[PDB]
Structure 1
Amino acid sequence: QNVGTQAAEEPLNLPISVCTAPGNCQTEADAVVLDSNWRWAHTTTGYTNCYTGNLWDTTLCPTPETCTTNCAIDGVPLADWSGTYGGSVTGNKFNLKFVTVSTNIGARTFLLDSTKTRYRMFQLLNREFTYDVDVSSLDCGLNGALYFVSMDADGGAAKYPTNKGGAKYGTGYCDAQCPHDVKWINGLANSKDWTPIPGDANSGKGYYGNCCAELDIWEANKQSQAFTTHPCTPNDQTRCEGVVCGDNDSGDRYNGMCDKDGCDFASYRMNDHTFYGPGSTFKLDSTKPFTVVSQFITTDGTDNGDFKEFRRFYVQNGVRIENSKVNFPGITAYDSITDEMCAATKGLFGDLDDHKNKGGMKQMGEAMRKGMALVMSIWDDHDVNMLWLDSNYPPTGNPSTPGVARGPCPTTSGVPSEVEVTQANAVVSFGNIKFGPIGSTV
């Protein structure tokens, strides 16, 4: 995309901590940038929309190349962050409102480095990543997500010279779902064969998808939470078409370059329904804030080893809370993501181990070694109504069959039109982000 001249781009300042030992950290003066999908797209030498509602203008965008020549994405000024997009920062806390009323629904954002010209790339192997979260106002059907993806640090600017904005304009998004709803891919409008998504007034799908590796630290609302590894072959940003995208709609979910299911550790799905929930007698009380700690263990305990284990623990009101465990007869009580856990649990659930097909923890680790961009988002799910996260999936499945039940939400929950009314004022908060060696962040 070209860059427009109507509004300066002003990312929100967000300090994080880089740590060397427990309680010995230094501030890193980073910032938050809005994903290019949420930006106004208009004519390069005017005010005329190139995209309105869920459609590209066919006169301006008869082809992707013409669209890209004629159109530009514009900046987010400071005033518009809260007023238009529902984003705000107080000290080291970042807040994202779900619906902001001209009416904005959801948000996806990235962490910029201290220069505000590149994404802050995290080399996560043999490191610990930690943050405080509040998901108390997110119920069934919503997801306040924090995760990493194998985006380029410059959003693709060096690879795709028609991308003028780079990381500064939140470009280059890709993930392990190979999404077609990304409006700008490889420096070009994804306007070919663009199709609105029914019941989604703001979104559509273009000819291409954009694939890359994804490490989900946090997919969650107050009812259920998960962390998940998604390797791809290769891991780096890859525009896809046809079978390579692994499109759900053509029966290709397991035929593409990315592991779409991922290998998940989701406490409720692993059959501990009392670990996490909205109340003081759950082990971890989702009505109150808490700290989420993630440790990325290698084979030799060094930065050069292969990724072998994703460990997790929590801190809430000064109380250390170890992760829940897998709880099925004849299955080891795993409390972390490893290749063995993935094989054993997917075996039990009858899920295809595409994680293993894509190179497993080792391949996931190669993405983490090269460095990944931090994503913070809030969203509802127009495909599957978040049932995969917090309900029975498939909805018609027996909840006593291992793998089906992922949370207590009813299978009628999560319809975007309903959650966008009922949960309009939901806000996820991510704060006090800390990064360092294992054992350094609490």
Structure 2
Amino acid sequence: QNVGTQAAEEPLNLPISVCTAPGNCQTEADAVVLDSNWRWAHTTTGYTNCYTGNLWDTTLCPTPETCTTNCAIDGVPLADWSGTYGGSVTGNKFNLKFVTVSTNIGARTFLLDSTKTRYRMFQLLNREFTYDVDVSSLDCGLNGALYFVSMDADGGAAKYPTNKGGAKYGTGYCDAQCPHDVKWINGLANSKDWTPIPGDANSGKGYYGNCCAELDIWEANKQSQAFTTHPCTPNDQTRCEGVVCGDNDSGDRYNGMCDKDGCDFASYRMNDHTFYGPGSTFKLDSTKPFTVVSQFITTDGTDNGDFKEFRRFYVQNGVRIENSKVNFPGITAYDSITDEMCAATKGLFGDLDDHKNKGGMKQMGEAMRKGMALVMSIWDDHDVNMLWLDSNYPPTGNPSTPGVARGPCPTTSGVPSEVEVTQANAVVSFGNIKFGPIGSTV
């Protein structure tokens, strides 16, 4: 995309901590940038929309190349962050409102480095990543997500010279779902064969998808939470078409370059329904804030080893809370993501181990070694109504069959039109982000 001249781009300042030992950290003066999908797209030498509602203008965008020549994405000024997009920062806390009323629904954002010209790339192997979260106002159907993806640090600017904005304009998004709803891919409008998504007034799908590796630290609302590894072959940003995208709609979910299911550790799905929930007698009380700690263990305990284990623990009101465990007869009580856990649990659930097909923890680790961009988002799910996270999936499945039940939400929950009314004022908060060696962040 070209860059427009109507509004300066002003990312929100967000300090994080880089740590060397427990309680010995230094501030890193980073910032938050809005994903290019949420930006106004208009004519390069005017005010005329190139995209309105869920459609590209066919006169301006008869082809992707012409669209890209004629159109530009514009900046987010400071005033518009809260007023238009529902984003705000107080000290080291970042807040994202779900619906902001001209009416904005959801948000996806990235962490910029201290220069505000590149994404802050995290080399996560043999490191610990930690943050405080509040998901108390997110119920069934919503997801306040924090995760990493194998985006380029410059959003693709060096690879795709028609991308003028780079990381500064939140470009280059890709993930392990190979999404077609990304409006700008490889420096070009994804306007070919663009199709609105029914019941989604703001979104559509273009000819291409954009694939890359994804490490989900946090997919969650107050009812259920998960962390998940998604390797791809290769891991780096890859525009896809046809079978390579692994499109759900053509029966290709397991035929593409990315592991779409991922290998998940989701406490409720692993059959501990009392670990996490909205109340003081759950082990971890989702009505109150808490700290989420993630440790990425290698084979030799060094930065050069292969990724072998994703460990997790929590801190809430000064109380250390170890992760829940897998709880099925004849299955080891795993409390972390490893290749063995993935094989054993997917075996039990009858899920295809595409994680293993894509190179497993080792391949996931190669993405983490090269460095990944931090994503913070809030969203509802127009495909599957978040049932995969917090309900029975498939909805018609027996909840006593291992793998089906992922949370207590009813199978009628999560319809975007309903959650966008009922949960309009939901806000996820991510704060006090800390990064360092294992054992350094609490």
TM-score scaled by structure 1? Answer: 1.00
Q: Give the Å deviation of 1:177.
A: 0.0
| Structure 2: 5+ residue stretches without partners | none
Deviations 1:6-46 (A, max 9, x none): 00000000000000000000000000000000000000000
Q: Give the Å deviation of 1:234.
A: 0.0
Q: Give the Å deviation of 1:370.
A: 0.0
3-state SS of paired residue (1:344)? helix
Separation (CA, whole Å) in 1 of partners of 2:212 and 2:19: 28
In structure 2, the partner of 1:423 is 423
Q: Give the Å deviation of 1:310.
A: 0.0
Q: Give the Å deviation of 1:297.
A: 0.0
3-state SS of paired residue (1:389)? helix
3-state SS of paired residue (2:226)? strand
3-state SS of paired residue (1:347)? helix
3-state SS of paired residue (2:178)? coil
Separation (CA, whole Å) in 1 of partners of 2:439 and 2:6: 46
Deviations 1:61-106 (A, max 9, x none): 0000000000000000000000000000000000000000000000
Q: Give the Å deviation of 1:281.
A: 0.0
3-state SS of paired residue (2:119)? coil
Instruction: List aligned pairs for 1:99-248, cutoff 5 A.
Output: 99-248=99-248
In structure 1, the partner of 2:271 is 271
Say what the alpha-carbon RMSD is for the aligned residues.
Answer: 0.0
Query: Where in structure 1 do 4 or more consecutive aligned residues deviate above 4 Å?
Result: none
Separation (CA, whole Å) in 2 of partners of 1:30 and 1:216: 21
3-state SS of paired residue (1:228)? strand
Separation (CA, whole Å) in 1 of partners of 2:123 and 2:377: 21
| Structure 1: 5+ residue stretches without partners | none
Task: Report % sequence identity.
Answer: 100
Q: Give the Å deviation of 1:126.
A: 0.0
In structure 1, the partner of 2:315 is 315
In structure 2, the partner of 1:16 is 16
Separation (CA, whole Å) in 2 of partners of 1:53 and 1:326: 44
Separation (CA, whole Å) in 1 of partners of 2:296 and 2:24: 20
Q: Give the Å deviation of 1:132.
A: 0.0
Q: Give the Å deviation of 1:173.
A: 0.0
Q: Give the Å deviation of 1:356.
A: 0.0
Q: Give the Å deviation of 1:295.
A: 0.0
Q: Give the Å deviation of 1:318.
A: 0.0
Deviations 1:225-271 (A, max 9, x none): 00000000000000000000000000000000000000000000000
In structure 2, the partner of 1:365 is 365
Q: Give the Å deviation of 1:278.
A: 0.0
Deviations 1:274-296 (A, max 9, x none): 00000000000000000000000
Deviations 1:209-232 (A, max 9, x none): 000000000000000000000000
Separation (CA, whole Å) in 1 of partners of 2:190 and 2:435: 35
Separation (CA, whole Å) in 1 of partners of 2:401 and 2:320: 32
Q: Give the Å deviation of 1:439.
A: 0.0
Separation (CA, whole Å) in 2 of partners of 1:37 and 1:114: 23
Separation (CA, whole Å) in 2 of partners of 1:66 and 1:349: 48
3-state SS of paired residue (1:420)? helix
Q: Give the Å deviation of 1:423.
A: 0.0
Q: Give the Å deviation of 1:184.
A: 0.0
Separation (CA, whole Å) in 2 of partners of 1:152 and 1:266: 29
Q: Give the Å deviation of 1:330.
A: 0.0
Equivalenced residues, count: 442
Q: Give the Å deviation of 1:429.
A: 0.0
3-state SS of paired residue (1:428)? strand
